[PDB]
Design a protein around this ligand. Structure first.
Ligand SMILES: NCCCC[C@@H](N)C(=O)O
Length: 159
């Protein structure tokens, strides 16, 4: 019975913890990348109302990413995931500080003065990108470790 409970607990961990975590981080990263793209798409814009509308929309998307990250942080496991996510959050705070300055300059001075904020803060943004990519790798590893253990336990049952 302790054998079956081991397999059932590892299946549950895989299906209800690991896979959701991976699906969620994948989706946050895709959203952040789209969000980043939108910050460059607002610069060629010429109508001020269209510019403000896009910034308001992107701030909503920023708040969704942030809420998703805060929610994810409550679930992180000690070790590589916690340390990686702690760093990711620091770089997220950094880039949203850049983004606040970018939005403010775009709306009060124009795209020509706002673009350099993006062009010159690449170290800040790539650090955030890199952390997402490391976190996804941790979860990819967890997915594979889960599978290996599930398969191994099917053996112990003598099945
Ligand atoms: N906080 C998310 C953790 C997901 C991976 C974890 N369930 C593991 O088996 O390693």
């Amino acid at each position: 019975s302790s054998e079956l409970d081991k397999i059932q607990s590892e299946l549950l961990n895989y299906t209800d913890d690991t896979l959701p975590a991976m699906e969620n981080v994948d989706a946050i990263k895709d959203k952040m990348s789209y969000w980043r793209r939108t910050q460059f798409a607002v610069l060629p814009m010429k109508d001020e109302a269209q510019i403000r509308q896009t910034i308001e929309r992107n701030n909503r998307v920023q708040a969704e990413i942030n809420d998703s990250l805060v929610a994810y942080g409550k679930t992180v496991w000690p070790g590589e995931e916690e340390q990686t996510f702690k760093r990711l959050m620091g770089n997220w705070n950094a880039y949203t500080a850049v983004t606040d300055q970018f939005n403010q300059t775009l709306l009060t001075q124009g795209a020509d003065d706002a673009y350099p904020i993006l062009a010159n803060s690449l170290s800040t943004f790539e650090a955030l990108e890199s952390d997402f990519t490391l976190l996804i790798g941790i979860l990819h590893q967890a997915m594979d470790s889960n599978k290996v253990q599930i398969l191994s336990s099917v053996k112990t049952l003598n099945s």
